[PDB]
Amino acid sequence: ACPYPFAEMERLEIHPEYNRLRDAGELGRVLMPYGGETWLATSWEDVAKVFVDPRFSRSATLGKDVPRVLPAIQQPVIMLMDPPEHTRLRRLATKALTSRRMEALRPRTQEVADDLIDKMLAKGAPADLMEDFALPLPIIMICELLGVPIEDQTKFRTWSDQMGAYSQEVVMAAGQSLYLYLSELIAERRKQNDLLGSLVRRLSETELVGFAVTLLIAGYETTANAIGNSVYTLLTHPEKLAELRKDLSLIPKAVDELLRIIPIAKQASWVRMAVEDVELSGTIVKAGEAVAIQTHSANTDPKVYDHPEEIDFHRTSNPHMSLGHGAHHCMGAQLVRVEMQTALGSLISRIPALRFAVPEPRIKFLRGRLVPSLEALPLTW
Template sequence: MTDTRQLGAARRYPFSEPDRLNLDPLYAELRREEPVTRVRLPYGEEAWLATRYQDVKVVLGDPRFSRALSVGRDEPRTSPQQIGGGILSMDPPDHSRLRRLVAKAFTARRVEQLRPATTAIADELVDAMAAAGPPADLVEAFSTPLPVRVICMLLGVPPTDQHLFRTWSEAIISTTSLSQETIVGYLGSLHAYMAGLIAQRRETPTDDLIGAMVQARDEDNDRLTEQEMVELAAGLLAAGHETTVTQISNFMYVLLTHPEQLAVLRARPELVPDAVEELMRYVPLGAASAFARYATEDLELSGVRIRAGEPVIAALSSANRDAAVFEEPDRLDLTRGAGPHIGFGHGVHHCLGAQLARMELQVALGTLLRRLPGLALAVDDKELPWKSGLLVRGLRSLPVTW
């Protein structure tokens, strides 16, 4: 790719428009030659972009980099509106205080208890697909309802209200797909809805996650403010399904367009957990990297001087393709093993729902392979429609047959 920047000027970022799930080749060039580079995003101040695995882990995990310092700053971003707020813009100890309240709901043991119910939902969705007959839109028939129903079950959201937050939650991942007015309206509706559920839990206590948060807040000297609880519940509801919805379809698209790897998985279904880890490494979920960390003191990354107060963006997708860590990183290999990928992030902001997402992705892939062994694309892959204007890459529809 031609570098059109003037000498000493920041590169325009993102480097290009998202192309399906293809990672811009400039990342590889930067990892080799300029691993920490100056960039300018569509909105906000200039930033540094870290592209190598080790540097990305430092930015995400070293306490000398702060998310809290983004508050009140013109944070570099791809959307007109500020991304920050809530738990994503906190450092310890405030971040730790909120995270502890919900961490118990996402332990490996708790998530495993949800696996049978998740499998039953997946089978029910495939039953409906099979009854209707091919072709089917996998996004609408399977990828979307599965995580939505699971997060509703975990949080205690009535199934009859699922259609509401499916619409509202796009506001959290929108960059340009929605107008600023629509985003504000959707977020207001989502927060008002969660406040209503919280009020219900006070009247009638429950043992779901929202009920547990209400109890913890009311019994812990109000250490969790009402606004924090509303924002945390809304964030869990939206983030708890949006990314998994997207990744189920992304993963199936990758498998269906890599027939040799799909054949390996069909022959060896015990590899599904490893396949999920490899696909988390291989698939660049983000349309661009975001959520800058601000240096709290002067330091160096790959020989580049980062001064206190400067924002640094960690390119997770680039880090997951670093040849210094992964052999033949641009090749999909479902037999590679879990490996040290950072598809779920790293450090204190490591994805809270990683265990839940892993389980849902394992169930989704395993069920589709088991129930629909002849699954194939119903159209040419170049005809598939992709979403735009969002923080994540994903398909609008995925027509399949079997």
């Protein structure tokens, strides 16, 4: 078993191998740094199975020395649950966290988006979209979706930023301040029905605050990167920026085509566990063996997509895996699209003379994460 990761993904590209195996119709076996060897799925068909098939448990690695990447062991989160606990827990949260409820935020997003622009270009010459726009937009929208008082939208932020750049005694101090402030908020909503109110309706207080902290994590630093990384990719392919400044009616299907093509992690997912013998790619991953997935190789499979390694805003359908598949599919999906749609949309519309302030090859990324994130994205206009 050839060791994994294959190469520290510097910048935003992928190691050839993944696509090599997809096409080989080969299921990879790799040696992860911690825990042991794992299997590795790269095909759309075989990444679809691991997302949706019930022969693969996410439960079965809580408290375990499982084929992993970071030494720390994972601490029961929703994304580490199987049916029917997961299903009862998702079934409830879906009744509060609605696709409607999320479309309902588009007018606010416009405000914070279009006034985040106002400020940014109202300041200096060159800017840093990351600190001036890509990072603030999603926390502000997270807050607004929780119905956090705008008088604490900053104090709050400051707490979510110190989850690193902050001392150990003031990491947990932040978390505990966020946990105790987020229960009190749910306490001051039980007497009244928005998202936190709707959540109180069968969920335990423990699961209620749990979820509120999860959404913060699941969709803050991820949504930042999507906005950041997309702008980047769009500026290094203007044939396709231009295609969006001519008509903005495209941006929905664009957001999804940018989601397909940009890698969401620097490497393969947390591993799932086979709870019964399964065939993937002609191999019998036996019960107990572990399988990690690559969404990118699935998101550019020629057996599923035409001209995969090419952008195209007219794709009939777009069954990408950047936002998950089946039971555990991203329950921000709608908010994400909303955020990203209005984020890029105005951004483009407002400032159609946008460009890098530096030679792209010179635009640096970070070494100390699992998701690809720009260290800074300086621009001009």
